[PDB]
mmCIF file with all atom_site columns, C-alpha atoms and ligand atoms in Angstrom:
data_model
loop_
_atom_site.group_PDB
_atom_site.id
_atom_site.type_symbol
_atom_site.label_atom_id
_atom_site.label_alt_id
_atom_site.label_comp_id
_atom_site.label_asym_id
_atom_site.label_entity_id
_atom_site.label_seq_id
_atom_site.pdbx_PDB_ins_code
_atom_site.Cartn_x
_atom_site.Cartn_y
_atom_site.Cartn_z
_atom_site.occupancy
_atom_site.B_iso_or_equiv
_atom_site.pdbx_formal_charge
_atom_site.auth_seq_id
_atom_site.auth_comp_id
_atom_site.auth_asym_id
_atom_site.auth_atom_id
_atom_site.pdbx_PDB_model_num
ATOM   1   C CA  . UNK A 1 1   ? 0.000  0.000  0.000   1.00 0.00 ? 4   UNK A CA  1
ATOM   2   C CA  . UNK A 1 2   ? 3.079  2.268  0.138   1.00 0.00 ? 5   UNK A CA  1
ATOM   3   C CA  . UNK A 1 3   ? 2.417  4.267  -3.059  1.00 0.00 ? 6   UNK A CA  1
ATOM   4   C CA  . UNK A 1 4   ? -1.362 4.625  -2.748  1.00 0.00 ? 7   UNK A CA  1
ATOM   5   C CA  . UNK A 1 5   ? -2.785 8.099  -2.684  1.00 0.00 ? 8   UNK A CA  1
ATOM   6   C CA  . UNK A 1 6   ? -3.625 11.180 -4.701  1.00 0.00 ? 9   UNK A CA  1
ATOM   7   C CA  . UNK A 1 7   ? -0.758 13.452 -5.735  1.00 0.00 ? 10  UNK A CA  1
ATOM   8   C CA  . UNK A 1 8   ? -0.525 16.653 -7.733  1.00 0.00 ? 11  UNK A CA  1
ATOM   9   C CA  . UNK A 1 9   ? 2.340  18.061 -9.806  1.00 0.00 ? 12  UNK A CA  1
ATOM   10  C CA  . UNK A 1 10  ? 4.366  20.854 -8.200  1.00 0.00 ? 13  UNK A CA  1
ATOM   11  C CA  . UNK A 1 11  ? 7.024  21.493 -10.807 1.00 0.00 ? 14  UNK A CA  1
ATOM   12  C CA  . UNK A 1 12  ? 8.749  19.787 -13.746 1.00 0.00 ? 15  UNK A CA  1
ATOM   13  C CA  . UNK A 1 13  ? 11.893 20.098 -15.910 1.00 0.00 ? 16  UNK A CA  1
ATOM   14  C CA  . UNK A 1 14  ? 12.212 19.786 -19.711 1.00 0.00 ? 17  UNK A CA  1
ATOM   15  C CA  . UNK A 1 15  ? 8.598  18.938 -20.455 1.00 0.00 ? 18  UNK A CA  1
ATOM   16  C CA  . UNK A 1 16  ? 8.624  20.509 -23.913 1.00 0.00 ? 19  UNK A CA  1
ATOM   17  C CA  . UNK A 1 17  ? 11.843 18.892 -25.251 1.00 0.00 ? 20  UNK A CA  1
ATOM   18  C CA  . UNK A 1 18  ? 10.895 15.459 -23.929 1.00 0.00 ? 21  UNK A CA  1
ATOM   19  C CA  . UNK A 1 19  ? 7.371  15.626 -25.318 1.00 0.00 ? 22  UNK A CA  1
ATOM   20  C CA  . UNK A 1 20  ? 8.505  16.580 -28.839 1.00 0.00 ? 23  UNK A CA  1
ATOM   21  C CA  . UNK A 1 21  ? 11.142 13.805 -28.919 1.00 0.00 ? 24  UNK A CA  1
ATOM   22  C CA  . UNK A 1 22  ? 8.440  11.218 -28.043 1.00 0.00 ? 25  UNK A CA  1
ATOM   23  C CA  . UNK A 1 23  ? 6.104  12.520 -30.736 1.00 0.00 ? 26  UNK A CA  1
ATOM   24  C CA  . UNK A 1 24  ? 3.385  14.299 -28.783 1.00 0.00 ? 27  UNK A CA  1
ATOM   25  C CA  . UNK A 1 25  ? 1.334  16.646 -31.009 1.00 0.00 ? 28  UNK A CA  1
ATOM   26  C CA  . UNK A 1 26  ? 2.590  20.200 -30.236 1.00 0.00 ? 29  UNK A CA  1
ATOM   27  C CA  . UNK A 1 27  ? -1.055 21.185 -29.636 1.00 0.00 ? 30  UNK A CA  1
ATOM   28  C CA  . UNK A 1 28  ? -1.183 18.873 -26.607 1.00 0.00 ? 31  UNK A CA  1
ATOM   29  C CA  . UNK A 1 29  ? 2.349  20.084 -25.707 1.00 0.00 ? 32  UNK A CA  1
ATOM   30  C CA  . UNK A 1 30  ? 1.226  23.688 -25.331 1.00 0.00 ? 33  UNK A CA  1
ATOM   31  C CA  . UNK A 1 31  ? -2.011 22.849 -23.505 1.00 0.00 ? 34  UNK A CA  1
ATOM   32  C CA  . UNK A 1 32  ? -0.061 20.485 -21.244 1.00 0.00 ? 35  UNK A CA  1
ATOM   33  C CA  . UNK A 1 33  ? 3.066  22.453 -20.199 1.00 0.00 ? 36  UNK A CA  1
ATOM   34  C CA  . UNK A 1 34  ? 1.564  24.390 -17.281 1.00 0.00 ? 37  UNK A CA  1
ATOM   35  C CA  . UNK A 1 35  ? -1.098 21.884 -16.205 1.00 0.00 ? 38  UNK A CA  1
ATOM   36  C CA  . UNK A 1 36  ? -0.531 20.606 -12.695 1.00 0.00 ? 39  UNK A CA  1
ATOM   37  C CA  . UNK A 1 37  ? -1.599 17.054 -13.279 1.00 0.00 ? 40  UNK A CA  1
ATOM   38  C CA  . UNK A 1 38  ? -3.089 14.668 -10.764 1.00 0.00 ? 41  UNK A CA  1
ATOM   39  C CA  . UNK A 1 39  ? -1.958 11.065 -10.355 1.00 0.00 ? 42  UNK A CA  1
ATOM   40  C CA  . UNK A 1 40  ? -3.958 8.504  -8.400  1.00 0.00 ? 43  UNK A CA  1
ATOM   41  C CA  . UNK A 1 41  ? -2.225 5.329  -7.299  1.00 0.00 ? 44  UNK A CA  1
ATOM   42  C CA  . UNK A 1 42  ? -3.717 2.206  -5.743  1.00 0.00 ? 45  UNK A CA  1
ATOM   43  C CA  . UNK A 1 43  ? -1.067 -0.267 -4.743  1.00 0.00 ? 46  UNK A CA  1
ATOM   44  C CA  . UNK A 1 44  ? -2.117 -3.665 -3.408  1.00 0.00 ? 47  UNK A CA  1
ATOM   45  C CA  . UNK A 1 45  ? 1.052  -5.698 -2.848  1.00 0.00 ? 48  UNK A CA  1
ATOM   46  C CA  . UNK A 1 46  ? 2.529  -6.146 -6.325  1.00 0.00 ? 49  UNK A CA  1
ATOM   47  C CA  . UNK A 1 47  ? -0.519 -4.875 -8.178  1.00 0.00 ? 50  UNK A CA  1
ATOM   48  C CA  . UNK A 1 48  ? -0.704 -1.204 -9.164  1.00 0.00 ? 51  UNK A CA  1
ATOM   49  C CA  . UNK A 1 49  ? -3.422 0.947  -10.655 1.00 0.00 ? 52  UNK A CA  1
ATOM   50  C CA  . UNK A 1 50  ? -2.576 4.445  -11.608 1.00 0.00 ? 53  UNK A CA  1
ATOM   51  C CA  . UNK A 1 51  ? -4.626 7.179  -13.195 1.00 0.00 ? 54  UNK A CA  1
ATOM   52  C CA  . UNK A 1 52  ? -2.920 10.301 -14.572 1.00 0.00 ? 55  UNK A CA  1
ATOM   53  C CA  . UNK A 1 53  ? -5.186 13.317 -15.277 1.00 0.00 ? 56  UNK A CA  1
ATOM   54  C CA  . UNK A 1 54  ? -3.846 16.254 -17.239 1.00 0.00 ? 57  UNK A CA  1
ATOM   55  C CA  . UNK A 1 55  ? -6.673 18.492 -18.429 1.00 0.00 ? 58  UNK A CA  1
ATOM   56  C CA  . UNK A 1 56  ? -8.989 16.380 -20.562 1.00 0.00 ? 59  UNK A CA  1
ATOM   57  C CA  . UNK A 1 57  ? -6.368 13.632 -20.981 1.00 0.00 ? 60  UNK A CA  1
ATOM   58  C CA  . UNK A 1 58  ? -7.046 10.786 -18.560 1.00 0.00 ? 61  UNK A CA  1
ATOM   59  C CA  . UNK A 1 59  ? -4.551 7.930  -18.845 1.00 0.00 ? 62  UNK A CA  1
ATOM   60  C CA  . UNK A 1 60  ? -5.322 4.899  -16.788 1.00 0.00 ? 63  UNK A CA  1
ATOM   61  C CA  . UNK A 1 61  ? -2.828 2.081  -16.240 1.00 0.00 ? 64  UNK A CA  1
ATOM   62  C CA  . UNK A 1 62  ? -2.289 -1.040 -14.210 1.00 0.00 ? 65  UNK A CA  1
ATOM   63  C CA  . UNK A 1 63  ? 0.611  -3.502 -13.900 1.00 0.00 ? 66  UNK A CA  1
ATOM   64  C CA  . UNK A 1 64  ? 1.916  -6.273 -11.708 1.00 0.00 ? 67  UNK A CA  1
ATOM   65  C CA  . UNK A 1 65  ? 5.528  -5.711 -10.558 1.00 0.00 ? 68  UNK A CA  1
ATOM   66  C CA  . UNK A 1 66  ? 7.878  -8.232 -12.256 1.00 0.00 ? 69  UNK A CA  1
ATOM   67  C CA  . UNK A 1 67  ? 5.294  -9.208 -14.926 1.00 0.00 ? 70  UNK A CA  1
ATOM   68  C CA  . UNK A 1 68  ? 5.011  -8.130 -18.560 1.00 0.00 ? 71  UNK A CA  1
ATOM   69  C CA  . UNK A 1 69  ? 2.382  -5.402 -18.676 1.00 0.00 ? 72  UNK A CA  1
ATOM   70  C CA  . UNK A 1 70  ? 0.973  -3.074 -21.313 1.00 0.00 ? 73  UNK A CA  1
ATOM   71  C CA  . UNK A 1 71  ? 1.458  0.639  -20.678 1.00 0.00 ? 74  UNK A CA  1
ATOM   72  C CA  . UNK A 1 72  ? -0.400 3.449  -22.349 1.00 0.00 ? 75  UNK A CA  1
ATOM   73  C CA  . UNK A 1 73  ? 2.105  6.262  -22.669 1.00 0.00 ? 76  UNK A CA  1
ATOM   74  C CA  . UNK A 1 74  ? 1.977  10.025 -23.387 1.00 0.00 ? 77  UNK A CA  1
ATOM   75  C CA  . UNK A 1 75  ? 0.987  9.583  -27.077 1.00 0.00 ? 78  UNK A CA  1
ATOM   76  C CA  . UNK A 1 76  ? -1.645 6.883  -26.679 1.00 0.00 ? 79  UNK A CA  1
ATOM   77  C CA  . UNK A 1 77  ? 0.909  4.263  -27.750 1.00 0.00 ? 80  UNK A CA  1
ATOM   78  C CA  . UNK A 1 78  ? 0.620  1.113  -25.703 1.00 0.00 ? 81  UNK A CA  1
ATOM   79  C CA  . UNK A 1 79  ? 3.958  -0.554 -24.953 1.00 0.00 ? 82  UNK A CA  1
ATOM   80  C CA  . UNK A 1 80  ? 4.747  -4.005 -23.485 1.00 0.00 ? 83  UNK A CA  1
ATOM   81  C CA  . UNK A 1 81  ? 7.291  -3.791 -20.664 1.00 0.00 ? 84  UNK A CA  1
ATOM   82  C CA  . UNK A 1 82  ? 8.009  -4.790 -17.060 1.00 0.00 ? 85  UNK A CA  1
ATOM   83  C CA  . UNK A 1 83  ? 7.869  -2.589 -13.982 1.00 0.00 ? 86  UNK A CA  1
ATOM   84  C CA  . UNK A 1 84  ? 10.129 -3.446 -11.089 1.00 0.00 ? 87  UNK A CA  1
ATOM   85  C CA  . UNK A 1 85  ? 10.266 -2.379 -7.495  1.00 0.00 ? 88  UNK A CA  1
ATOM   86  C CA  . UNK A 1 86  ? 13.757 -1.547 -6.349  1.00 0.00 ? 89  UNK A CA  1
ATOM   87  C CA  . UNK A 1 87  ? 12.754 -1.453 -2.687  1.00 0.00 ? 90  UNK A CA  1
ATOM   88  C CA  . UNK A 1 88  ? 9.318  -0.441 -1.360  1.00 0.00 ? 91  UNK A CA  1
ATOM   89  C CA  . UNK A 1 89  ? 9.559  3.124  -2.558  1.00 0.00 ? 92  UNK A CA  1
ATOM   90  C CA  . UNK A 1 90  ? 10.851 2.942  -6.075  1.00 0.00 ? 93  UNK A CA  1
ATOM   91  C CA  . UNK A 1 91  ? 9.255  1.895  -9.350  1.00 0.00 ? 94  UNK A CA  1
ATOM   92  C CA  . UNK A 1 92  ? 11.595 1.421  -12.387 1.00 0.00 ? 95  UNK A CA  1
ATOM   93  C CA  . UNK A 1 93  ? 10.840 0.638  -16.049 1.00 0.00 ? 96  UNK A CA  1
ATOM   94  C CA  . UNK A 1 94  ? 12.120 1.216  -19.585 1.00 0.00 ? 97  UNK A CA  1
ATOM   95  C CA  . UNK A 1 95  ? 9.833  1.800  -22.555 1.00 0.00 ? 98  UNK A CA  1
ATOM   96  C CA  . UNK A 1 96  ? 10.744 3.061  -26.030 1.00 0.00 ? 99  UNK A CA  1
ATOM   97  C CA  . UNK A 1 97  ? 14.325 3.656  -24.744 1.00 0.00 ? 100 UNK A CA  1
ATOM   98  C CA  . UNK A 1 98  ? 13.046 5.928  -21.965 1.00 0.00 ? 101 UNK A CA  1
ATOM   99  C CA  . UNK A 1 99  ? 14.110 4.991  -18.434 1.00 0.00 ? 102 UNK A CA  1
ATOM   100 C CA  . UNK A 1 100 ? 11.310 5.909  -15.979 1.00 0.00 ? 103 UNK A CA  1
ATOM   101 C CA  . UNK A 1 101 ? 12.079 6.112  -12.266 1.00 0.00 ? 104 UNK A CA  1
ATOM   102 C CA  . UNK A 1 102 ? 9.216  6.867  -9.800  1.00 0.00 ? 105 UNK A CA  1
ATOM   103 C CA  . UNK A 1 103 ? 10.350 7.419  -6.200  1.00 0.00 ? 106 UNK A CA  1
ATOM   104 C CA  . UNK A 1 104 ? 8.132  8.103  -3.207  1.00 0.00 ? 107 UNK A CA  1
ATOM   105 C CA  . UNK A 1 105 ? 9.683  9.983  -0.298  1.00 0.00 ? 108 UNK A CA  1
ATOM   106 C CA  . UNK A 1 106 ? 7.034  10.478 2.403   1.00 0.00 ? 109 UNK A CA  1
ATOM   107 C CA  . UNK A 1 107 ? 4.491  12.638 0.648   1.00 0.00 ? 110 UNK A CA  1
ATOM   108 C CA  . UNK A 1 108 ? 6.596  13.513 -2.362  1.00 0.00 ? 111 UNK A CA  1
ATOM   109 C CA  . UNK A 1 109 ? 6.840  11.546 -5.602  1.00 0.00 ? 112 UNK A CA  1
ATOM   110 C CA  . UNK A 1 110 ? 9.694  12.367 -7.918  1.00 0.00 ? 113 UNK A CA  1
ATOM   111 C CA  . UNK A 1 111 ? 9.484  10.906 -11.368 1.00 0.00 ? 114 UNK A CA  1
ATOM   112 C CA  . UNK A 1 112 ? 12.467 11.042 -13.643 1.00 0.00 ? 115 UNK A CA  1
ATOM   113 C CA  . UNK A 1 113 ? 12.248 10.071 -17.305 1.00 0.00 ? 116 UNK A CA  1
ATOM   114 C CA  . UNK A 1 114 ? 15.399 9.933  -19.475 1.00 0.00 ? 117 UNK A CA  1
ATOM   115 C CA  . UNK A 1 115 ? 15.562 9.533  -23.269 1.00 0.00 ? 118 UNK A CA  1
ATOM   116 C CA  . UNK A 1 116 ? 19.214 9.787  -24.294 1.00 0.00 ? 119 UNK A CA  1
ATOM   117 C CA  . UNK A 1 117 ? 20.538 13.119 -22.991 1.00 0.00 ? 120 UNK A CA  1
ATOM   118 C CA  . UNK A 1 118 ? 16.997 14.277 -22.121 1.00 0.00 ? 121 UNK A CA  1
ATOM   119 C CA  . UNK A 1 119 ? 16.089 14.216 -18.366 1.00 0.00 ? 122 UNK A CA  1
ATOM   120 C CA  . UNK A 1 120 ? 12.380 14.966 -17.753 1.00 0.00 ? 123 UNK A CA  1
ATOM   121 C CA  . UNK A 1 121 ? 11.801 15.228 -13.966 1.00 0.00 ? 124 UNK A CA  1
ATOM   122 C CA  . UNK A 1 122 ? 8.468  15.806 -12.170 1.00 0.00 ? 125 UNK A CA  1
ATOM   123 C CA  . UNK A 1 123 ? 7.839  16.508 -8.507  1.00 0.00 ? 126 UNK A CA  1
ATOM   124 C CA  . UNK A 1 124 ? 4.422  15.775 -7.037  1.00 0.00 ? 127 UNK A CA  1
ATOM   125 C CA  . UNK A 1 125 ? 2.890  16.111 -3.587  1.00 0.00 ? 128 UNK A CA  1
ATOM   126 C CA  . UNK A 1 126 ? 0.071  14.298 -1.790  1.00 0.00 ? 129 UNK A CA  1
ATOM   127 C CA  . UNK A 1 127 ? -3.385 16.016 -1.898  1.00 0.00 ? 130 UNK A CA  1
ATOM   128 C CA  . UNK A 1 128 ? -5.761 14.195 0.543   1.00 0.00 ? 131 UNK A CA  1
ATOM   129 C CA  . UNK A 1 129 ? -7.959 11.209 -0.464  1.00 0.00 ? 132 UNK A CA  1
HETATM 130 C C1  . PLM B 2 .   ? -7.258 19.665 -22.527 1.00 0.00 ? 201 PLM B C1  1
HETATM 131 C C2  . PLM B 2 .   ? -6.546 18.371 -22.910 1.00 0.00 ? 201 PLM B C2  1
HETATM 132 C C3  . PLM B 2 .   ? -5.079 18.620 -23.240 1.00 0.00 ? 201 PLM B C3  1
HETATM 133 C C4  . PLM B 2 .   ? -4.216 18.488 -21.988 1.00 0.00 ? 201 PLM B C4  1
HETATM 134 C C5  . PLM B 2 .   ? -2.772 18.138 -22.335 1.00 0.00 ? 201 PLM B C5  1
HETATM 135 C C6  . PLM B 2 .   ? -2.511 16.654 -22.111 1.00 0.00 ? 201 PLM B C6  1
HETATM 136 C C7  . PLM B 2 .   ? -1.356 16.443 -21.147 1.00 0.00 ? 201 PLM B C7  1
HETATM 137 C C8  . PLM B 2 .   ? -0.109 15.940 -21.859 1.00 0.00 ? 201 PLM B C8  1
HETATM 138 C C9  . PLM B 2 .   ? 1.020  15.779 -20.846 1.00 0.00 ? 201 PLM B C9  1
HETATM 139 C C10 . PLM B 2 .   ? 1.487  14.335 -20.756 1.00 0.00 ? 201 PLM B C10 1
HETATM 140 C C11 . PLM B 2 .   ? 2.115  14.094 -19.390 1.00 0.00 ? 201 PLM B C11 1
HETATM 141 C C12 . PLM B 2 .   ? 1.850  12.674 -18.894 1.00 0.00 ? 201 PLM B C12 1
HETATM 142 C C13 . PLM B 2 .   ? 3.142  11.997 -18.460 1.00 0.00 ? 201 PLM B C13 1
HETATM 143 C C14 . PLM B 2 .   ? 3.312  12.077 -16.944 1.00 0.00 ? 201 PLM B C14 1
HETATM 144 C C15 . PLM B 2 .   ? 3.182  10.706 -16.287 1.00 0.00 ? 201 PLM B C15 1
HETATM 145 C C16 . PLM B 2 .   ? 4.502  10.252 -15.710 1.00 0.00 ? 201 PLM B C16 1
HETATM 146 O O1  . PLM B 2 .   ? 5.505  11.007 -15.767 1.00 0.00 ? 201 PLM B O1  1
HETATM 147 O O2  . PLM B 2 .   ? 4.606  9.116  -15.173 1.00 0.00 ? 201 PLM B O2  1
HETATM 148 C C1  . PLM B 2 .   ? 1.654  7.814  -19.178 1.00 0.00 ? 202 PLM B C1  1
HETATM 149 C C2  . PLM B 2 .   ? 3.026  7.606  -18.557 1.00 0.00 ? 202 PLM B C2  1
HETATM 150 C C3  . PLM B 2 .   ? 3.357  6.127  -18.441 1.00 0.00 ? 202 PLM B C3  1
HETATM 151 C C4  . PLM B 2 .   ? 3.854  5.858  -17.030 1.00 0.00 ? 202 PLM B C4  1
HETATM 152 C C5  . PLM B 2 .   ? 4.991  4.845  -16.986 1.00 0.00 ? 202 PLM B C5  1
HETATM 153 C C6  . PLM B 2 .   ? 5.394  4.616  -15.531 1.00 0.00 ? 202 PLM B C6  1
HETATM 154 C C7  . PLM B 2 .   ? 4.836  3.290  -15.017 1.00 0.00 ? 202 PLM B C7  1
HETATM 155 C C8  . PLM B 2 .   ? 5.085  3.035  -13.528 1.00 0.00 ? 202 PLM B C8  1
HETATM 156 C C9  . PLM B 2 .   ? 4.988  4.262  -12.619 1.00 0.00 ? 202 PLM B C9  1
HETATM 157 C C10 . PLM B 2 .   ? 3.580  4.820  -12.430 1.00 0.00 ? 202 PLM B C10 1
HETATM 158 C C11 . PLM B 2 .   ? 3.504  5.873  -11.312 1.00 0.00 ? 202 PLM B C11 1
HETATM 159 C C12 . PLM B 2 .   ? 2.645  7.085  -11.690 1.00 0.00 ? 202 PLM B C12 1
HETATM 160 C C13 . PLM B 2 .   ? 3.421  8.402  -11.702 1.00 0.00 ? 202 PLM B C13 1
HETATM 161 C C14 . PLM B 2 .   ? 2.869  9.378  -10.656 1.00 0.00 ? 202 PLM B C14 1
HETATM 162 C C15 . PLM B 2 .   ? 3.736  10.629 -10.491 1.00 0.00 ? 202 PLM B C15 1
HETATM 163 C C16 . PLM B 2 .   ? 3.638  11.573 -11.678 1.00 0.00 ? 202 PLM B C16 1
HETATM 164 O O1  . PLM B 2 .   ? 2.519  11.829 -12.228 1.00 0.00 ? 202 PLM B O1  1
HETATM 165 O O2  . PLM B 2 .   ? 4.703  12.106 -12.110 1.00 0.00 ? 202 PLM B O2  1
#
């Protein structure tokens, strides 16, 4: 249950570079850059559900740690990959050559995505519920 909760974006680095390199329509890129998105996570042991809401875009995912899962990414593209826990508080995966690291520290989730030289970091904070 460690990750469960509702969290909202505080700040982020390199949103616009990252999002162009992954092929997000620039129209979504401009609408999306200053949105403070909400993520909802339900962890139950190894099973995760997470919903990411950014404006009108709602992206809902689920995965079992250690198993092949299908992840809907930024673009709508669904990619087969594995998510691993590296200790209770860290989720790690690689899709489309992006390394995603999600780390919970108390009430703060830091998410770092790297595609080559591009490091897209996001910092989110718990918001009751
Ligand atoms: C009004 C609708 C348009 C709103 C713009 C859509 C938001 C696009 C931003 C994509 C960010 C989602 C990736 C963050 C999830 C994560 O880092 O794990
Ligand atoms: C749409 C982006 C795909 C997400 C790929 C990461 C899969 C495992 C981690 C999910 C945790 C959700 C991230 C919450 C914090 C945040 O919004 O930055």
